[PDB]
Design a protein around this nucleic acid. Structure first.
Lengths: 88, 156, 57, 131, 52, 54, 226
RNA sequence: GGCGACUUUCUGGUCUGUAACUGACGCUGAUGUGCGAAAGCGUGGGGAUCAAACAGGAUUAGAUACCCUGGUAGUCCACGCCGUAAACGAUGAGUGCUAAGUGUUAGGGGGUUUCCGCCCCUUAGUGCUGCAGCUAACGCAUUAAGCACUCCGCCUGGGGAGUA
């Protein structure tokens, strides 16, 4: 995946307050790092199908948290789409 | 004193290298029209001796049938394998309505007024045992209040 | 070669009188048990004498 | 992700009854507490106990058995359920086992027994059959 | 591959007959006398292990 | 501990009298020791510290 | 006085049970603890059971009934014959014959024989017989008193039964529950207490655990007579 | 489905323990969209063994079978297809609850201490026995085919037929 110093870096910007990892927008950002890391691996390795349902599962766990985040505050959802580029 | 009643006699032969066999078996229902009924089977070759083999075999297993008078206490379904009878209480002037084998196990205890229908399978061995197993699991109003700890008027 | 047939037994606590009883009920010349009061492993055996001997291990 | 709480309560009670257990504990609720409170008032269990823990405090049941090693609750059936909720008016509010067993019913007064719903003339969601 | 000397030939055979039986030569080439199916040796090894 | 693939003397008591592998049935080692052994016995076959057959 | 005292009860060694890995989970009530692969039977609670075993067996013989004693475990065979003679009851040493409580309309057919075959050679009708027919008439004679030796003078059904082990004598206990005969027995680990109505938790593979426990139950009927 | 030399790079999942954090974010899932043994098919490679078809020699009462010699596609790789198997634990997924005994795999906490070896408890796998309960019977039985609740697929006589 990604290294811990890469992983601990990306939980600094989207953190809401100190020692609050596990927040929805701090575990969507680390997914979007892991999404973009593995389909770059999968771009040059097109035959790796067992790693593809690892991608397709964590696509699903990112979508279920974006759909969760709209249900309690919409204005936080609009900020995350602008901060890191997602469609929809 | 007991009241004998047959259900059916069967003509069964097991294949032998020489001459085949002549076993005539029969199941009977034995009751006293007061709340105590048992069944049993008997295998012999002399047919009136094959009956009395099944009558004495019924004598070792008599089940006490609880009763609010002229009917059964509550609504049950008996189960034994595939046979399954239904048993609804009735008014005391309806007449006991039942099938072939289940009428004999219902007349031999004194009820004479209940709704019934033999669901499931059909063979007379199983539905007479799936009725006894139904009548095994009946409860009076007075003995439940002994277990539950209330009185007969507190249950209502 | 010589093949020694093993007879497995599970060690159990009892009186010496009990060990004599159980040994006779099998006719075995050796019975090994843990002594009920001493707690140690004991072997009751029949000597070449015909009398009993008791070994503590 | 168990999807019916007070049916999971009701089969804990049946499975403990089958093996002659006399003591089990539940992840409790209000309706779990007050169904278990209504079985001791009708007299199926011996005594329910306290609710203590920080999250969803447990409670213990103490089943009650006959003196000839018989069991009191013989059969226990959840009738209303998710997907098909059954509701009963007070007119056709049914007697269980020809009036022998009971039927605890959630009405708009808190849940009450089979007896206590007709003379109160209220109906509601009929929860289960206890016999 | 064991050298046996300072004796006769009818005693070097007794070494060599058990220095081959404790080796994967005779039980190996008897296995590969014919191609077995790739899921019947998994049961052949299972029968040669459940009996021990 | 962890088996290093250069430590030949403790690693060649596990090789056979021809170069095969003794099973853990006859040696007596544990499960995870045997397969941490076998990835070290086969890196030592590759760099000629131990043969394939003798 | 009333019960066995605590000293001689554990001196017989009844606190020992069978091995752990050889355990019946229904015997959890009558087990104190585990000590080095063996179970320890609850010694205070079996005193609260052997007095209850003493209470009814007192008053069974008050009615004049006949209590059957059975013992077939090889280290407890002749510890039940000597206690049945002191009690004046009927014993079993050898194996269960397979119907001596249930098909005993064909067993008393042969208890009629043992009342006859020993009469057959004390009088005449013995010199005229062939010398090998003398053998099989005597080879029948000992094999009757092997199995039915303690049922020599018993001509009716019993009213209680006393077993040393429900495991090895499971043929007897299955005939007991069909006849509704009350049952009392020595159980331990690897024994089911469900089929026994009157439970005595005690050791079973020791002689003093039998003999210093089966004697008082044999003594329990004597002061129920008078 | 499957996966067996070894090394490196790239990458997916599970389990254990701690409790910091988020605060029902969950489960199932029609249509849809992707993986899917072998044998096949396409475009090229490569072709050692093995080997349908095929050739020849024997056997037999007879052969196109079995057996033997030889042998092409195939078996192998790369890219597109095909999408079917007794694809089977003939058993959908999820979460609870209900005697025990016993192997073994991956941990953890203990207790002695072992001079690295055991013992007890617990978690997640994987087997073998076996109560209650269940089954039509075989059997299943904390890895249910037991007791429950949710949702999805599917059956309702045998042929005709998985055929028009």
């Amino acid at each position: 995946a990604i290294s811990q110093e890469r992983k601990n870096e990306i939980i600094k910007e989207y953190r809401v307050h100190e020692t609050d990892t596990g927040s929805p927008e701090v575990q969507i950002a680390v997914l979007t790092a892991e999404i973009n890391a593995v389909n770059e691996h999968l771009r040059t390795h097109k035959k790796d199908h067992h790693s593809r349902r690892g991608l397709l599962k964590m696509v699903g766990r990112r979508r279920h948290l974006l759909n969760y985040l709209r249900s309690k505050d919409i204005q936080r959802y609009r900020e995350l789409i602008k901060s890191l580029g997602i469609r929809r | 004193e007991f009241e004998e009643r047959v259900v059916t006699i069967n003509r069964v032969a097991k294949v032998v290298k020489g001459g085949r066999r002549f076993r005539f078996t029969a199941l009977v229902v034995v009751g006293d029209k007061n709340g105590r009924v048992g069944f049993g089977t008997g295998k012999a070759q002399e047919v009136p001796e094959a009956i009395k083999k099944a009558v004495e075999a019924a004598k070792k297993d008599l089940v006490v049938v609880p009763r609010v008078e002229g009917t059964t206490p509550h609504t049950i379904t008996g189960r034994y394998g595939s046979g399954s009878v239904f048993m609804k209480p009735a008014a005391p002037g309806t007449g006991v309505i039942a099938g072939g084998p289940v009428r004999a196990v219902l007349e031999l205890a004194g009820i004479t007024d209940i709704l019934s229908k033999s669901l499931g399978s059909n063979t007379p061995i199983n539905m007479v045992r799936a009725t006894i197993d139904g009548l095994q699991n009946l409860k009076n109003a007075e003995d439940v209040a002994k277990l539950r700890g209330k009185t007969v008027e507190e249950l209502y | 070669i010589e093949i020694i047939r093993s007879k497995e037994f599970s060690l159990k606590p009892m009186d010496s009188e009990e060990a004599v009883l159980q040994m006779n009920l099998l006719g075995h010349d050796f019975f090994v048990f843990t002594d009920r009061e001493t707690d140690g492993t004991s072997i009751v055996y029949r000597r070449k004498d015909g009398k009993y001997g008791l070994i503590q291990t | 992700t168990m999807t019916d709480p007070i049916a999971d309560m009701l089969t804990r009670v049946r499975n403990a009854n089958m093996v002659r257990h006399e003591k089990l504990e539940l992840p409790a609720s209000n309706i779990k507490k007050e169904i278990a409170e209504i079985l001791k008032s009708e007299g199926f269990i011996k005594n329910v106990e306290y609710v203590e823990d920080d999250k969803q405090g447990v409670l213990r049941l103490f089943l009650k058995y006959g003196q000839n090693d018989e069991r009191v609750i013989t059969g226990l059936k959840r009738i209303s359920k998710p997907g098909l909720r059954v509701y009963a008016k007070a007119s056709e509010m049914p007697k269980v086992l020809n009036g022998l067993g009971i039927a605890l019913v959630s009405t708009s007064e808190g849940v009450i027994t089979d007896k206590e719903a007709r003379k109160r003339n209220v109906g509601g969601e009929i929860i289960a059959y206890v016999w | 591959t064991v050298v046996r000397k300072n004796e006769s030939l009818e005693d070097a055979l007794r070494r060599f007959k058990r220095s081959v039986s404790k080796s994967g030569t005779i039980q190996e080439v008897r296995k590969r006398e014919f191609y077995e199916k790739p899921s019947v040796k998994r049961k052949k090894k299972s029968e040669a292990a459940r009996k021990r | 501990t962890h088996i290093d693939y250069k430590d030949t003397e403790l690693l060649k008591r596990f090789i056979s009298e021809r170069g095969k592998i003794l099973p853990r049935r006859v040696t007596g080692t544990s499960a995870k020791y045997q397969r941490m052994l076998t990835t070290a016995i086969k890196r030592s076959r590759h760099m000629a510290l131990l043969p394939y057959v003798k | 006085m009333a019960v066995i005292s605590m000293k001689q009860l554990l001196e017989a060694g009844v606190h020992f049970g069978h091995q752990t890995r050889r355990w019946n989970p229904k015997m959890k009530k009558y087990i104190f603890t585990e000590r080095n692969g063996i179970y320890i039977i609850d010694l205070q609670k079996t005193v609260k059971k052997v007095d209850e075993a003493y209470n009814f067996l007192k008053q069974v013989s008050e009615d004049g009934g006949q209590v059957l004693f059975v013992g077939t475990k090889k280290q407890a065979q002749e510890s039940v014959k000597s206690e049945a003679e002191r009690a004046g009851q009927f014993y079993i040493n050898q194996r269960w014959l397979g119907g001596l409580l249930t098909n005993y309309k064909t067993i008393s057919k042969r208890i009629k024989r043992i009342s006859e075959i020993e009469k057959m050679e004390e009088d005449g009708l013995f010199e005229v017989l062939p010398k090998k027919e003398v053998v099989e008439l005597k080879k029948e004679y000992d094999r009757l008193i092997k199995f039915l030796g303690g049922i020599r003078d018993m001509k009716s059904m019993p009213q209680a039964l006393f077993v040393v082990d429900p495991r090895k004598e499971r043929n007897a206990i299955a005939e007991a529950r069909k006849l509704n005969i009350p049952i009392v027995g020595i159980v331990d680990t690897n024994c089911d207490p469900d089929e026994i109505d009157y439970v005595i938790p005690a050791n079973d593979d020791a002689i003093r655990a039998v003999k210093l426990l089966t004697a008082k139950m044999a003594d329990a009927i004597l002061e129920g007579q008078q």
